[PDB]
Amino acid sequence: HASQARTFGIFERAVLKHPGSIELWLAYLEFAAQVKATKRWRRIMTRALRLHPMNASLWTLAGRRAAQNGDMQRARAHFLRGCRFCTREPTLWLEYARCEMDWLARMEAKKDGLILPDPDAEGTDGTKKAAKPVFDAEQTKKLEQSPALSGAIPIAVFDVARKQPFWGPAAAEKFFDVFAKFGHLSCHERIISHVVTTMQELFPNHPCTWSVHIRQPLVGVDVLTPAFPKALRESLARLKAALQSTTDRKALATKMVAWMDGILAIEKLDAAIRTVLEHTKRSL
């Protein structure tokens, strides 16, 4: 028990020496969480977010804790507040989308020390510290009434993210990636399609859009299932077409090599498939 005290002192004097260090805060929070000091955890969270309001890691940590405790209401609450704050970096938005798909995963399976930064706070000159709320009152109501297994919310998160400063092809591809797991859910097809299309419409020839376009056919699929080789052939067709397009070949080749490495990583992959993929990679 005395060790709790000692360690706490270590962290405390540590973040006092250097409050800029986010990692210290994170590490301290983890320690507090493991010794089940929840009150202290809330207080440390309040202090860290107070002085690091735009750090995604903190916000995600909070929202994800509320969801793991079981109420998706606060989860959503924290994440939305935070997204008003965290707006120069995709991170918090990606993590909210993820948290949301995770909830769908649980729904398909079934079938106070904490003070968060006020978004409606003004600075010295009148400027708001946080962007306007992510969803209008009307909009939130339409999403609440929306069917749970529709996946209307993560899509909504994606579309509103489109209005944020961090919006670009790279951010979009990160959403595709968040969503590209969760292949086992009904909504993912519609969602992924939305994302790839959108990217195609807005960033027509970007190596990222090409990325998601090549990678798209293999999202629902597993091996072995006859759908996998067909999809692989489709994917490869997309890849050839990509290498012949007027596009950054270097960036594309990098992403695509990583992708194939990921594929070759899998166990019980067909021999001829391994060979042809390796040749295809060696080409890059």
DSSP track, 39-101 = HHHHHHHHHHHHH-TT-HHHHHHHHHHHHHTT-HHHHHHHHHHHHHH--SSTHHHHHHHHHHH
How many residues appear in the chain? 284
DSSP state of 181: S
DSSP state of 113: -
Cβ-based neighbour number of residue 151 at 10 Å: 23
Contact 215, 237 (CB under 8 A): no
- Closest C-alpha among 218, 236, 223 to residue 266: 223
Expressed in Å, this structure's resolution amounts to 3.3
Place of tokens 């750090």: 55
DSSP track, 119-142 = SS-B-TTS-BSSPSPSS-HHHHHH
Cβ-based neighbour number of residue 196 at 10 Å: 21
- How far apart CA 167 and CA 261 sit, in angstroms, is 28
How far the first Cα of the chain sits from its last, in Å, is 57
Half-sphere exposure of 167 (CA within 13 A, CB side): 14
